[PDB]
Paper text:
The inhibitory nanobody, CA10761, hereafter referred to as Nb-Inhibitor-61 (or [name]), rapidly inhibited [name]-2 currents (IC50 = 685 ± 18 nM). This inhibitory effect appears specific as this nanobody has no functional effect on the related [name]-1 or on TASK-3 channels but is active against mouse [name]-2. In addition, its long CDR3 loop forms multiple interactions with the top of M3 and the M3-PH2 loop as well as additional interactions with the top of M2 and the P2-M4 loop. However, the most striking feature of this long CDR3 loop is that it also inserts a lysine residue (K103) deep within the extracellular ion exit pathway that emerges just below the Cap domain. Overall, the position of this nanobody obstructs most of this ion exit pathway with the remaining gap being only 1.35 Å wide compared to >4 Å in the apo state. Consistent with a role for a positively charged residue at this position, the K103R mutant produced similar, if not greater, inhibition whilst neutral or negative substitutions (K103N and K103D) resulted in a markedly reduced inhibitory effect. Consistent with such an allosteric effect, the M4 helix of the subunit that interacts with this nanobody is in the Down conformation. However, all 4 ion binding sites in the filter appear to be occupied and no obvious structural changes are seen in the filter itself or in the surrounding region. Thus, although additional allosteric effects of this nanobody on the filter gate cannot be excluded, Lysine 103 clearly contributes to channel inhibition by directly blocking the ion exit pathway.
Author numbering:
A (entry chain B): 75 to 226, 231 to 324
B (entry chain A): 74 to 225, 237 to 323
C (entry chain C): 2 to 122
Amino acid sequence: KTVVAIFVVVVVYLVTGGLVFRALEQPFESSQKNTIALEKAEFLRDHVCVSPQELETLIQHALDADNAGVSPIGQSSQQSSHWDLGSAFFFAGTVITTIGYGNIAPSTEGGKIFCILYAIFGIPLFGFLLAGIGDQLGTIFGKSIARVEKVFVSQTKIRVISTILFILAGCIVFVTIPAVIFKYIEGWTALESIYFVVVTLTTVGFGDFVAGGNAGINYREWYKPLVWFWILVGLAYFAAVLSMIG
Amino acid sequence: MKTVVAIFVVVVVYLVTGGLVFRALEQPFESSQKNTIALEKAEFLRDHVCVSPQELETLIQHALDADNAGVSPIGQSSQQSSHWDLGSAFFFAGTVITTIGYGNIAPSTEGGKIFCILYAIFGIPLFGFLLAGIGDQLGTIFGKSIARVEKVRVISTILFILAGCIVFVTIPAVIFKYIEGWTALESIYFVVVTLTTVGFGDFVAGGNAGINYREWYKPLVWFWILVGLAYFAAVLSMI
Amino acid sequence: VQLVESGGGLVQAGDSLRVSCAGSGFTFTSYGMGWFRQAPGKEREFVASINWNSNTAYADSVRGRFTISRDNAESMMYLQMNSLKPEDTAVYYCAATRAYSKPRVDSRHYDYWGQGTQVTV
Ligand SMILES: [K+]
Ligand SMILES: [K+]
Ligand SMILES: [K+]
Ligand SMILES: [K+]
């Protein structure tokens, strides 16, 4: 009668969450539905040489390329590759870290077969590195807080302040500072940058905002793998805090 | 300090090696798709003189803006905003706390993004408490089953993993293959991508807007994710 | 650092007029700019917006009539206003955002602003 109580709390949290997300997104979806219907009607009015069926075929052809991983915006020939050494390193890192953006996913049958075996053997391999970093860093943090405890209201209270301090430092070095960097590089708003860092470091990875390629502009080949190194050190910093607490 | 660094090197090598394999598997398809879409855009402008090349890009961007928000720009829908209703927002809420994040439907408003940060920060550890609670109660049942076998150990452990791959991996994939209309590989690919909380979003259960789904189907899939995530957690911990 | 508007005139109802906004002292291609307006006795209202390339976004009151555009080679932005109504007579200010990914619509996100140009219908 303890796990069932937790299950009820979780179901209630999903129903409550569903009610809040519905009220926040229903007016925007209705406005976007009305907007796109008007933009299609006005395009045909402004371009008399385009038939209504020819417009739909163009849209579906652009969506066919977009779903495959190729953005139909701008000159595709001039655009960089989503599967070059740098981008495929970030795709590999995206699989083993269970973030799964889903923006540049495998389309070929061979790519799907290798992706199953890559996640099955790569996710536990990454977990061994993530735990190894967290246990080595938890030892350093354990030694630093034991030195603070030796100097000193409550022995439990002095450990909570240290925990808050570790979270605050991590939220500046791995959350605040990187979000400022993404805001300038990608051209996202301040809200979108924090939203991206939270969605990424929590391994949710929606894919609505992706560190690299979120524009038809040419991104450097060294920028995208460096973002994975931020993901590695960010995921690992919070793992050492939870290992120290436990 | 010469053990974690060795693991780090193995992981980096695994990413470089993985990147080389994925590049060889997907580079010919990406090149073909890039050539295809560039030709379709050039032919549209050749057939429609009255359309400027910039006016074409603006139309594409506008269609993609609606598509990413959840509204398909193909044809016309209605007040059927079934992407953010009580049923779909319940699955989106599940998509967040389980860290799967399909991202087929995501928050667009600023308020929706603010609530999503606080929903994941307080919901992911809440789901983790249920996932650990199920796994510890499940591990006790496993322990009692393996102690009964020992009274009559690696083979038994392998048998308990093979049972999970049939009940939670093989059987569900067969059901999705017929219902959704996916190929045998796509079904296994979906189950692996889902149970490993990767959630790309390329294949979503109950996502094909053209299928008249029965009411008992979509909530049954989320029950499978819940009971499968605990059994799959024991496999990844053993590995 | 500086935004300059030009094209404010007096026009008849149901007629077309185009106003221009030129950027100076900053990298034009890295800033997503847009238009805003303010009629006498009313608060500031959104008009049009564009990203670094060709993604536009308009207010529900001016879609299908107004057209925002940019020519990065000439470091300029244009707003072609068609079939101008007597409800469009306002001071039009052009503003720019360091966040270029999508066409921003909230005035809070726009950093640099213009002096305004009076279009009277
Ligand atoms: K995950
Ligand atoms: K994920
Ligand atoms: K995901
Ligand atoms: K995703």
